[PDB]
Amino acid sequence: MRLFGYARVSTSQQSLDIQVRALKDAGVKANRIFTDKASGSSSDRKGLDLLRMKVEEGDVILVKKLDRLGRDTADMIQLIKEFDAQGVSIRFIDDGISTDGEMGK
Numbered sequence: 001m002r003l004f005g006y007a008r009v010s011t012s013q014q015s016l017d018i019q020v021r022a023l024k025d026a027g028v029k030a031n032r033i034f035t036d037k038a039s040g041s042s043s044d045r046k047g048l049d050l051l052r053m054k055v056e057e058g059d060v061i062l063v064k065k066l067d068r069l070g071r072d073t074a075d076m077i078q079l080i081k082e083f084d085a086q087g088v089s090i091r092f093i094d095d096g097i098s099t100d101g102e103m104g105k
Contacts, residue, residue, distance in 0.1 A: 002059045003028045006047055007035030010067040015039070023065035026093055048079040055088040064093040 005023025009015030020033045032041065036047040055061060061083055063069065068075035080099065083090055092098035 002032055002056050003031045003062065004034065004051055004055055005029075005062045005064065006051055007033060007064070008047060009036065009038045010037060018066070019064065022066060022093070023062055026062040026064045026091070028062045034037055037087075042062075052079055052082050052086075055083060055086060057087050059088045061088060061090040062093070063090060073082075 005026065006020025006030030007016065007018075007023055009019065011018070016035050016037060019035050020028075020030060023033055024030060032054070034047040036044045038044050065066065073084040074081075082101060084099070089100055090098055
């Protein structure tokens, strides 16, 4: 079990620092802060692409999104399903958890 957190800069100011502190405040290790430097030549959605290969068995993925995780096809559900199949959990700042096993537990 590890403390992984997902982040993504939304403001030109020190956004990345605003997300990491949001994950640490949530209970995420600074060494495990897979944020997204969206402030680059183009969008940067690799914080989850790498987090998908860094989460351990039964790891907790804290997500303190302070704007929007993604709404269109499954931007906020794709990696969520990839983690649910990897036996990894995903804590949401909205209420601590989001869909921790919604089958019958």
